[PDB]
Amino acid sequence: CTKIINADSEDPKYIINVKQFAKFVVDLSDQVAPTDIEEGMRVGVDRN
Amino acid sequence: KLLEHKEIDGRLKELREQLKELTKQYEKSENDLKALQSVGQIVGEVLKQLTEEKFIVKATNGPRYVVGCRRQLDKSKLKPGTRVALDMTTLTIMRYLPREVDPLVYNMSHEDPGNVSYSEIGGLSEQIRELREVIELPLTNPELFQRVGIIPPKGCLLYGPPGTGKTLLARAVASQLDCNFLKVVSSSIVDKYIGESARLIREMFNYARDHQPCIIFMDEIDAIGGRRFSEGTSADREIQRTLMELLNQMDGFDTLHRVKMIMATNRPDTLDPALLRPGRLDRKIHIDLPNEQARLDILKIHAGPITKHGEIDYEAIVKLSDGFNGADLRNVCTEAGMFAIRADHDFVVQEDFMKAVRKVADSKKLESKLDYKPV
Amino acid sequence: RTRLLDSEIKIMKSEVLRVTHELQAMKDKIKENSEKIKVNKTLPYLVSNVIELLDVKCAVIKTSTRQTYFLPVIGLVDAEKLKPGDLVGVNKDSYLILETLPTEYDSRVKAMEVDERPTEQYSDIGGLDKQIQELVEAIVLPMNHKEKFENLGIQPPKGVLMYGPPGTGKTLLARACAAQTKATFLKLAGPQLVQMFIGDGAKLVRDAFALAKEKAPSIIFIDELDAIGTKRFDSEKAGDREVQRTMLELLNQLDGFQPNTQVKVIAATNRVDILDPALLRSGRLDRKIEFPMPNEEARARIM
Amino acid sequence: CGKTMLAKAVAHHTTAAFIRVVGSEFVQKYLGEGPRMVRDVFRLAKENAPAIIFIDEIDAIATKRFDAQT
Ligand SMILES: Nc1ncnc2c1ncn2[C@@H]1O[C@H](COP(=O)(O)OP(=O)(O)OP(=O)(O)O)[C@@H](O)[C@H]1O
Ligand SMILES: Nc1ncnc2c1ncn2[C@@H]1O[C@H](COP(=O)(O)OP(=O)(O)O)[C@@H](O)[C@H]1O
Ligand SMILES: [Mg+2]
Ligand SMILES: [Mg+2]
Numbered sequence: 001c002t003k004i005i006n007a008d009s010e011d012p013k014y015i016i017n018v019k020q021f022a023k024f025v026v027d028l029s030d031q032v033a034p035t036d037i038e039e040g041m042r043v044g045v046d047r048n
Numbered sequence: 049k050l051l052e053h054k055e056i057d058g059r060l061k062e063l064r065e066q067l068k069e070l071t072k073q074y075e076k077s078e079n080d081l082k083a084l085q086s087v088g089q090i091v092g093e094v095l096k097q098l099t100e101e102k103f104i105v106k107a108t109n110g111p112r113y114v115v116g117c118r119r120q121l122d123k124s125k126l127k128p129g130t131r132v133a134l135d136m137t138t139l140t141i142m143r144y145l146p147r148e149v150d151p152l153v154y155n156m157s158h159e160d161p162g163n164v165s166y167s168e169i170g171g172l173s174e175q176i177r178e179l180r181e182v183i184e185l186p187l188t189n190p191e192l193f194q195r196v197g198i199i200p201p202k203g204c205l206l207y208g209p210p211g212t213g214k215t216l217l218a219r220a221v222a223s224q225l226d227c228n229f230l231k232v233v234s235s236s237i238v239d240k241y242i243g244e245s246a247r248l249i250r251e252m253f254n255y256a257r258d259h260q261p262c263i264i265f266m267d268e269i270d271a272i273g274g275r276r277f278s279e280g281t282s283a284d285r286e287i288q289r290t291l292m293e294l295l296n297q298m299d300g301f302d303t304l305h306r307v308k309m310i311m312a313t314n315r316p317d318t319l320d321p322a323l324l325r326p327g328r329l330d331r332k333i334h335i336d337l338p339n340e341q342a343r344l345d346i347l348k349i350h351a352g353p354i355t356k357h358g359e360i361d362y363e364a365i366v367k368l369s370d371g372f373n374g375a376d377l378r379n380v381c382t383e384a385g386m387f388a389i390r391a392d393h394d395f396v397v398q399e400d401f402m403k404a405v406r407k408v409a410d411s412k413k414l415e416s417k418l419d420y421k422p423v
Numbered sequence: 424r425t426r427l428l429d430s431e432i433k434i435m436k437s438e439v440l441r442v443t444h445e446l447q448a449m450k451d452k453i454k455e456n457s458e459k460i461k462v463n464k465t466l467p468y469l470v471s472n473v474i475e476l477l478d479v480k481c482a483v484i485k486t487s488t489r490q491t492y493f494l495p496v497i498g499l500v501d502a503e504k505l506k507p508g509d510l511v512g513v514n515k516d517s518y519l520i521l522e523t524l525p526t527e528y529d530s531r532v533k534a535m536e537v538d539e540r541p542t543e544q545y546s547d548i549g550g551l552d553k554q555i556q557e558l559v560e561a562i563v564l565p566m567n568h569k570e571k572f573e574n575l576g577i578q579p580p581k582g583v584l585m586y587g588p589p590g591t592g593k594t595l596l597a598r599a600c601a602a603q604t605k606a607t608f609l610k611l612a613g614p615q616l617v618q619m620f621i622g623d624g625a626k627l628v629r630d631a632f633a634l635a636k637e638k639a640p641s642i643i644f645i646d647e648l649d650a651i652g653t654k655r656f657d658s659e660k661a662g663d664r665e666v667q668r669t670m671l672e673l674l675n676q677l678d679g680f681q682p683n684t685q686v687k688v689i690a691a692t693n694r695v696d697i698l699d700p701a702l703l704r705s706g707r708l709d710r711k712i713e714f715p716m717p718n719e720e721a722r723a724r725i726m
Numbered sequence: 727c728g729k730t731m732l733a734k735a736v737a738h739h740t741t742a743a744f745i746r747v748v749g750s751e752f753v754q755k756y757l758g759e760g761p762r763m764v765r766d767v768f769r770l771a772k773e774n775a776p777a778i779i780f781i782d783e784i785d786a787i788a789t790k791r792f793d794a795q796t
Contacts, residue, residue, distance in 0.1 A: 005530070006528070006533075008525075015470075015524070021487070021488060022469055022470065022471075022486050022487035022488045023469075023470045023487050024467050024468060024469060024470065025466060025467065025468035025470070025512050025522075025524075026466075026467065027466055039530070039533065040530040040533065040534075049424055049425075049427065050426050050427060050430065051427070052424070052427035052430075052431065053426060053427050053430035053431070056427070056430050056431040056433075056434035056435075057430065057434055059434055059437070059438055060433065060434040060437035060438065063434075063437045063438045063440065063441035063444075064437060064440070064441065064444070066441050066444050066445050067440070067441065067444035067445075067447070067448075070444075070445065070448035070449070071444070071447070071448050071451075073448065074448045074451035074452060074455065077452070077455045077456075077459070078451070078455060080455070080458075080459065080499060081454070081455050081458060083496055083498070084458070084462055084498060084499075084517065084519055085496075085517070086494055086495050086496040086517065086519060087517060087518065088492040088493060088494055088517075088518040089492070089493035089494070089495070090490075090491065090492065090493070091483060091491035091492065091493055107491075108491045109489070109490060109491075110756060133493045143493075145493070148474070148475065148483070149475055149507070150474070151473070151474055151475060151507035151508040152508070154475075154507045154508065155507070155508050160680075160681060162680075162681065210700070210701050210704045211704045211705055211706065215679045215680055218680075219680065231680065233672065233675050233676075233680065234671065234675075235622075235625045235668060235669075235671060235672035235675070235676075236629075238621055238622040238625070238668065239621070239622045239626075240620035240621055240622055240623060241755060242753060242754070242755045243753040243754055243755050244755060246750065246751075246753065247755075267675060267679070267680060268671050268674065268675055270655070270667070270671065271664070271667065271668045271671045271672075274664070275657065275659060276659065277659065277660060277661070277662075278659060278660035278661070279789055279790060279791045280660065280661040280662070281663070281664075282793045282795075282796055283621050283664070283665055284664055285789065286753070287621075287664070288785070288786070289750050289753060289786045292750050292783040292785060292786045293748075293750040293751075293783075293786070295783070296748055296750070296782055296783055299730070300730055300748070300782060301730065301733075301734070301746060314701055315655065315657075317657045318655065318657045353576050353577075354575065354576070354577070355575045355576065373704065373705055375704060375705045375706045376704075376705035376706075378578075378705070378706065379705040379706065379709065381577070382577050382578060382579075382580060382709075383580070385572070385575050385577040386561075386580065388575060389560070389564070389571070389572075394574060394575055395575075396575065408705070411711055412705075414695050414696075414703070414711070415700050415703065416654065416700040418700075
């Protein structure tokens with residue numbers, strides 16, 4: 001699990017944050033909608 | 049007749065245009081077909097030299113490594129102390145590098161387009177030439193101090209009540225150098241990390257040794273300055289470490305030359321006397337409340353671009369002006385137009401100034417009235 | 424008609440070259456886009472910070488894995504739009520920068536911004552119409568009639584303060600004007616600029632005033648300023664400092680070096696004697712107004 | 727009171743190896759760089775010569791109170 005910094009317009013292109021490590025541009029899965037992926041939220045995130 | 053020749057060539061030129069334009073569009077993306085293959089060159093530093101091929105480095109990451117180099121890249125030039133570039137895979141030094149500029153300092157250097165001048169300031173010209181004496185005179189003429197036989201001072205500071213022009217003076221100085229005037233807010237230099245608050249004081253002044261005629265300005269030192277403590281909270285430990293790095297970096301084991309430090313504060317009471325030492329801080333410039341002539345001066349400065357009518361007795365404004373700042377006269381000239389903004393008078397009548405002084409005057413009844421004499 | 428067949432034959436040869444030309448570049452796009460979507464399907468972007476841009480053209484960055492990297496070749500972003508101190512999305516293995524990521528804004532700063540418009544109207548506020556009037560004209564008119572202040576020509580006023588007994592209505596005007604103007608309203612709590620680690624409240628100041636710098640129609644509110652605005656004191660052996668750090672960047676960052684007229688400050692306290700007079704100067708907080716107790720008629724009006 | 731100046735004069739007229747460290751630089755960001763930075767200086771004083779270490783602003787390191795929570 002991680003923490004979301006923010007999204008951007010027109011695209012998913014999420015900005016993620018973790019405990020100590022760096023910050024990534026990440027994406028959804030197909031199992032969830034982009035509705036409740038609101039900013040400042042903890043999400044479970046695969047390792048690869 | 050060749051009349052049908054030019055009618056034919058019109059499809060030939062635009063025929064080749066479909067080659068040239070889309071071929072250039074394939075060329076601009078053809079640069080990225082191989083241009084996206086560069087691999088990093090881990091930023092390191094040369095510790096010493098063991099043999100001609102046995103070198104020894106340490107990254108900005110962690111541990112110390114033993115490394116080789118390329119046989120064509122001037123191994124004699126690899127001095128202990130330089131910043132070099134590495135290999136990620138086989139760990140060999142690829143290319144010597146210049147010094148770093150640590151972009152907080154690059155974004156400290158030249159981001160002020162403030163073009164205020166000495167014409168704008170008024171009333172403290174003795175302190176203007178007095179402050180000029182350290183930063184402009186020996187920077188242009190060292191030979192008089194060399195013949196007399198005394199070294200010019202290192203740095204000086206500015207103290208007084210708030211709103212006497214202490215920031216405005218340094219901004220008037222800031223419209224002169226444009227490359228080697230480094231201005232410090234004394235709050236960007238601290239973070240929650242271990243020694244990064246000290247790394248900034250290291251490499252700002254390393255950059256000051258890099259650019260020899262240079263001015264360091266220090267605004268509101270009371271956050272970082274301090275007197276000392278008997279070690280109450282856990283936060284002021286490393287801040288005292290950050291300050292004691294600064295004091296040794298001022299005049300410890302170094303020819304402090306051509307790097308002139310100008311400081312400023314509102315209270316020189318919460319300061320270290322070791323920082324207030326005449327070895328380190330050489331002159332203490334006292335900026336006081338304006339006199340009647342200087343309030344007349346600042347009044348005529350801020351009274352310039354005001355649509356008025358010529359009946360302004362500036363004497364009476366100064367006469368009710370007792371114990372005023374350099375900015376509250378700008379508040380009076382601002383607020384006479386705040387009387388002019390009602391009843392739609394585009395001009396300014398002479399009465400709204402005496403109304404304005406009678407509002408600004410009792411507006412500052414809630415002031416604290418401290419003089420803050422340096423000790 | 425002699426040479427028109429030869430020149431028409433050459434032009435037909437040129438169109439016959441144009442067919443394989445558009446086919447040539449139209450075939451040239453596939454192999455380059457196949458690796459373009461290869462470096463774009465590496466969508467996990469390990470963002471970094473642009474340390475420095477060389478001239479011997481090159482660049483050095485630092486990923487937020489605390490890792491420094493030299494690079495000879497920049498990538499898809501050119502050098503001209505970049506500067507030392509930026510932050511970009513970088514490839515993982517090649518460490519090759521790809522995009523340009525816009526801002527660095529904290530989630531607490533994002534929590535400060537309203538999106539609700541709490542509706543209040545001035546006839547819900549009876550018997551304060553002088554302070555209401557001088558409050559509205561000092562803020563709203565530098566947002567709607569700028570050429571009126573430039574007509575005579577003055578710098579507009581900057582920084583209002585309200586003080587008095589804590590029941591006279593101080594939040595009420597802020598929620599009133601927050602319903603009135605259609606600008607970027609931004610509120611603050613008193614001890615919100617108080618942090619455990621050092622420098623975090625100060626960076627929280629410069630991030631908020633960076634965001635209010637970004638929104639050019641925007642005004643800033645502070646509730647209960649005395650939580651951070653305590654007057655300083657000289658003490659050995661003890662004494663806080665970290666609150667006075669953020670207070671000093673509130674002073675300098677508010678007013679002084681590199682000022683601007685884009686935001687207006689609305690500060691709310693009830694007690695004044697605690698406050699450091701450095702923020703009480705003339706220009707950091709211009710219009711200091713008190714809210715007295717209602718005389719008789721406003722007491723009838725409130726009920 | 728000539729605290730730095732006397733070390734300048736002795737360091738000028740000395741004939742042995744002089745090692746001159748600044749006592750607020752042992753606080754590196756990384757772990758271990760500090761302690762290794764402590765031990766290799768005295769190792770170089772050992773291997774080098776009958777040498778002289780100089781340390782200034784000892785208050786940056788040797789304080790009285792401590793806190794095993796930061
Ligand atoms: N006598 C004066 N005449 C004209 N302008 C003045 C006068 N006094 C002050 N001012 C103006 O008012 C502002 C306040 O003065 P000054 O800049 O010296 O305060 P400061 O030292 O920057 O405050 P702080 O350092 O506490 O933030 C200045 O920018 C200056 O231009
Ligand atoms: N016109 C008015 N005059 C005085 N008080 C009012 C008026 N309208 C509403 N109030 C009440 O007074 C309060 C105003 O809040 P305020 O006095 O700013 O709180 P505090 O200053 O203690 O933080 C509101 O909670 C509201 O119920
Ligand atoms: Mg309130
Ligand atoms: Mg000394």
